[PDB]
Structure formats: C-alpha cells, structure tokens
Amino acid sequence: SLATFHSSFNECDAAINSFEEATRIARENKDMETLNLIMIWIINFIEVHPEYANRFYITVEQIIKYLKNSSDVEDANIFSNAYKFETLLSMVKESKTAEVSSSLLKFMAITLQNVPSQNFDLFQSLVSYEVKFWKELGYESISDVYEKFLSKTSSSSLRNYDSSIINQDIK
Amino acid sequence: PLRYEPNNRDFACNIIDDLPKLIRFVKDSKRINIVPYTQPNSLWRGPDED
Numbered sequence: 001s002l003a004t005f006h007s008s009f010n011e012c013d014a015a016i017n018s019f020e021e022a023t024r025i026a027r028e029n030k031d032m033e034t035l036n037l038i039m040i041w042i043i044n045f046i047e048v049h050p051e052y053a054n055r056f057y058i059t060v061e062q063i064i065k066y067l068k069n070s071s072d073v074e075d076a077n078i079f080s081n082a083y084k085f086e087t088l089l090s091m092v093k094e095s096k097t098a099e100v101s102s103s104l105l106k107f108m109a110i111t112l113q114n115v116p117s118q119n120f121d122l123f124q125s126l127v128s129y130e131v132k133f134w135k136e137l138g139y140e141s142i143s144d145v146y147e148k149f150l151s152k153t154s155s156s157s158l159r160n161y162d163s164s165i166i167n168q169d170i171k
Numbered sequence: 172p173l174r175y176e177p178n179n180r181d182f183a184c185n186i187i188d189d190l191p192k193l194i195r196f197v198k199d200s201k202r203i204n205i206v207p208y209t210q211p212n213s214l215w216r217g218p219d220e221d
Contacts, residue, residue, distance in 0.1 A: 098189040105191060137186070 004041075004158045012049055019045075020057075036070070036078060039063055043085045048159045050092070060089060076114065080122055083107040087129060097137075104133060124151055 003022065006015035019041075026034050043060055046053050053060055067082035083106040090100050108126060116123040127150045134142045155164040193208040210216070 096189075097186070101190055 003045075007045060007048070007158045008160055010160065012052065015045070016052065016055060023057075036067075039067065040078070040081055045158065047085070047088060060085070064089070077119065077122075080107065080110045080114070080119070083110065084122065084125060084129065091129075091133065091136075100133070104129065120151075120154075121156060124154060124156070 003015040003019040006012075006018060023038060026038055042056065042058070043063060046056070046060060064082060064086045067078060068086075070078055070082070083103065087100065087103045087107055090103050108130070111119070111122055111126055127146050131143050131146045131150060134146070152168070153164045155161070155167075195206050195208045197204060197206055
C-alpha cells in the first residue's frame with residue numbers, strides 16, 4: 001500500500017524496493033491466500049508502467065501461466081483478473097486477431113457471469129480494452145456503443161489522482 | 172461453385188472467420204444444453220464430408 005502510494009506520485013523506482021520486501025514477509029507468514037493478492041498487484045503496477053517489466057524477479061508470462069491453473073474453487077475474481085492481463089500482453093505482442101478475440105472472450109464471459117456492478121474496477125477495464133480493441137480494428141460504430149459505458153473522472157487506484165484531468169485534456 | 176483465388180490486388184480481408192462462431196440454446200427434457208450454431212438451411216448446404 002505504501003508501494004501503491006509511491007506509484008501514485010510517479011516515484012516508480014522507490015515503490016519497487018518497498019514492494020520487494022513485501023514478498024519476503026509473505027513467505028514468513030506461510031499463508032497461500034495473500035500471495036495471490038501480491039501477485040495480482042504485480043501486473044496491475046506493470047500495466048500502468050510497462051517499462052519496468054524487466055526489473056521484476058518474475059516475468060509477466062510466468063504469472064499468467066500460474067493464475068490460469070491456480071485452482072477450481074475459492075478464486076471467483078482471480079480468473080477474471082488473470083485473463084485480462086493475458087489480453088493486454090497479446091494486444092501489445094500484436095498476436096493474431098483470432099487469438100486476441102478468443103482471449104478477450106474469456107475475460108468478457110467471466111466478468112459478466114458474476115455481478116459486474118460490485119466489481120466496478122474490472123468492468124471499466126473491460127470497456128477500456130474493448131473500445132481500444134475495436135477501435136484498433138477500425139470500427140467506430142462498435143467503439144461508440146461501448147464508449148458510452150466507460151466512466152470518466154473515475155480513473156483507477158495506484159495511478160495518480162489528476163490522471164483523469166490530464167486524460168481529458170489530451171482529447 | 173465460387174472460385175476466389177488469392178490475389179494481391181484484393182486486400183478485402185475477412186474478420187468474421189477470426190471472430191468465434193456462435194452457439195445455440197436448445198433445451199431437452201432433462202436439462203438445457205448448448206450446441207454449436209448451424210444455419211436452418213445449413214444441413215443441406217454444409218460443406219460435404221464427401
């Protein structure tokens with residue numbers, strides 16, 4: 001959380017050292033459930049700052065392989081998180097459009113299956129990817145429908161607080 | 172039979188193939204099942220095995 005606060009002020013590097021020591025303490029507790037919270041926070045920080053993917057002790061692809069086969073029960077939102085991170089990497093990796101659509105299908109189906117209202121953060125992230133995904137395909141008619149659902153000024157945690165004002169200024 | 176040979180001057184790529192094919196909801200007596208989508212007239216128009 002202090003690492004999160006550090007990332008909010010764009011310190012970045014100072015957060016890395018603070019976060020690193022969080023992994024060591026988790027091992028001492030010898031509790032499995034907290035590592036998933038640690039692992040989820042990993043790529044959320046990399047998603048905002050992709051330039052630091054090399055600095056971590058675990059590559060992003062390693063996490064996706066772990067979370068996909070994490071368990072079959074007591075996860076609920078872990079898989080909804082797991083598949084969206086694969087979609088961002090596949091989109092960045094300029095993978096084949098057949099695989100990107102299938103991967104995005106996995107993330108859309110699992111998010112809407114459970115309640116989307118309570119998990120407001122991932123629901124907004126779905127819209128941001130789908131508008132970006134379809135805008136990249138060149139179909140503004142599809143992008144427009146999903147654009148009315150993207151929330152403004154809401155932004156997200158661990159990414160500043162004036163990011164929404166700046167983003168509105170860019171447009 | 173249509174013969175659309177690949178031509179460089181044709182950049183009209185298809186995206187419907189890349190998008191996954193739809194499904195159908197049909198319910199039997201025991202439960203509701205999920206089956207692959209087939210066009211009402213696709214049974215006599217489907218690509219023949221032979």
